[PDB]
Design a protein around this ligand. Structure first.
Ligand code: HAZ
Lengths: 218, 215
């Protein structure tokens, strides 16, 4: 048992407060333990923010002056994180965790981007080779997901059927807008006889688009 | 509020090699409250060593910790591919509790040239007046590979957005991705588009180009 799961809006505008909830199951948040809220910034630097002890008294990272506030709900078994007057620096993956000794339990982590940027859906572009690719032993297709925001775009091939030899590259920011790509490789005999589609989803903008890679030549 | 310093920050280790990570504190801290954390990409850190030298559950014997005062170190006797990850040392001796910068460990493997792919813009994009030319440099090692974009012999550096994946769990290789984005205009104004890859491998750069022949 003992499970932690973070939740809350993943995009807050500057000058606002970001709130996260950590729902604990399989252990009373009053039985024992300190319930920490720990964040990881891009670059990977981790920062201990604070904790709400089982008894109810909180301890806060002094760096997080009068911006932090941690509270809980005994009945529902979950604690909260309220961080005020946020800035782009608070963009980070937030975790809630506990632990002592050899044992520790962390939540899956929740990404939170602080930005005044409007949520933009992606434009998915199928990437096929030039007219007359010779066709060696195998064919390498591609998929470019461009101009979206905030982060969290998911790309699978053929609804996940095509798993091996796929390469989803991390998103780069350029002009306050993300770009991402993914190549897949199958044997020359697979494509284009068997359909190869690109499955993209950007929950922030509620967009889900499939883009099959039609060949340019033959 | 002790500051913890980790070195090296990045390091490549050959399989079977003994590596020692270090964690220096700004002021003495009680060994008891010095934990180490391992973080594989995609997952949150997992306690690896607690109280300086005690191995957490599931942690293999090739690992061990040692320390007291200012210096604390994590040791791996025989590096394995699954040991490639980030190791963070934490301290909850003083308040507030602080972490180190981390130490990323890379696993060395037989060198390998990348399989390059170049893709012209899709009609969908041109219709929007944009023109991206994507080049995929897959399954290579080392990661320090240099990618130049040629256009009718000329070199174009502005408007290039690159991206690497982390080292692969299966083959320990890397994969890159260069996207040269242009307007439908300078695109429709040139012919050959070259993706020249300069890796530690081949003397002759790995070149893959196409011409906009309209098809
Ligand atoms: C190690 C860090 C940083 C420092 C604070 N703690 O909470 C440990 C910690 O203090 N744990 C901690 C502290 C006290 C108790 N105490 C109890 O559970 C009381 C039990 C009483 C009883 O048995 O009736 C239990 C656990 C965390 C654990 C999780 C992690 C990633 O941030 C670190």
């Amino acid at each position: 048992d003992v499970q932690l799961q973070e939740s809350g809006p993943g995009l807050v505008k500057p000058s606002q407060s970001l709130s996260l909830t950590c729902t604990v199951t399989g252990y009373s948040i009053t039985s024992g333990y300190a319930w920490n809220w720990i964040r990881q910034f891009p670059g990977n630097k981790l920062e201990w923010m604070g904790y709400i002890r089982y008894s109810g008294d909180t301890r806060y990272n002094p760096s997080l002056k009068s911006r932090i506030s941690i509270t809980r709900d005994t009945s529902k078994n979950q604690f909260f994180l309220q961080l005020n007057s946020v800035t782009t620096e608070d963009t980070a993956t937030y975790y809630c965790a506990i632990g002592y000794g050899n044992s520790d339990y962390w939540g899956q982590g929740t990404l939170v981007t602080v930005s005044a940027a409007k949520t933009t859906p992606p434009s998915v572009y199928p990437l096929a080779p030039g007219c007359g690719d010779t066709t060696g032993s195998s064919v390498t297709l591609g998929c470019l997901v461009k101009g979206y925001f905030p982060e969290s775009v998911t790309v699978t091939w053929n609804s996940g059927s095509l798993s091996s030899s796929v390469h989803a590259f991390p998103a780069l920011l350029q002009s306050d807008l993300y770009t991402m790509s993914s190549s897949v490789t199958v044997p020359s005999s697979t494509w284009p006889s068997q359909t190869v589609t690109c499955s993209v989803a950007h929950p922030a903008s509620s967009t889900t688009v499939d883009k099959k890679l039609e060949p340019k030549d033959c | 509020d002790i500051v913890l310093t980790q070195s090296p920050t990045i390091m490549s280790v050959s399989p079977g090699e003994k590596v020692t990570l270090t964690c220096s504190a700004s002021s003495s801290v009680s060994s008891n409250y010095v934990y180490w954390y391992q973080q594989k990409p995609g997952s949150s850190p997992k306690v690896w060593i607690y109280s300086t030298s005690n191995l957490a559950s599931g942690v293999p014997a090739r690992f061990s910790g040692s320390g007291s005062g200012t210096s604390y170190s994590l040791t791996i006797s025989s590096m394995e591919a699954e040991d490639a990850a980030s190791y963070f040392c934490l301290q909850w001796s003083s308040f507030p509790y602080t972490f180190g910068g981390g130490t990323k460990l890379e696993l060395k493997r037989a060198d390998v040239a990348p399989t390059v792919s170049i893709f012209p813009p899709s009609s969908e994009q041109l219709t929007s007046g944009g023109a991206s030319v994507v080049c995929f440099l897959n399954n290579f090692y080392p990661k320090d590979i240099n990618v130049k974009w040629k256009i009718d012999g000329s070199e174009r550096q502005n408007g290039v957005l690159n991206s690497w994946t982390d080292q692969d769990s299966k083959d320990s290789t890397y994969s890159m991705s260069s996207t040269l984005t242009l307007t439908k205009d300078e695109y429709e104004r040139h012919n050959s588009y070259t993706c020249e890859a300069t890796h530690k491998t081949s003397t002759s750069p790995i070149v893959k180009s196409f011409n906009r022949n309209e098809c």
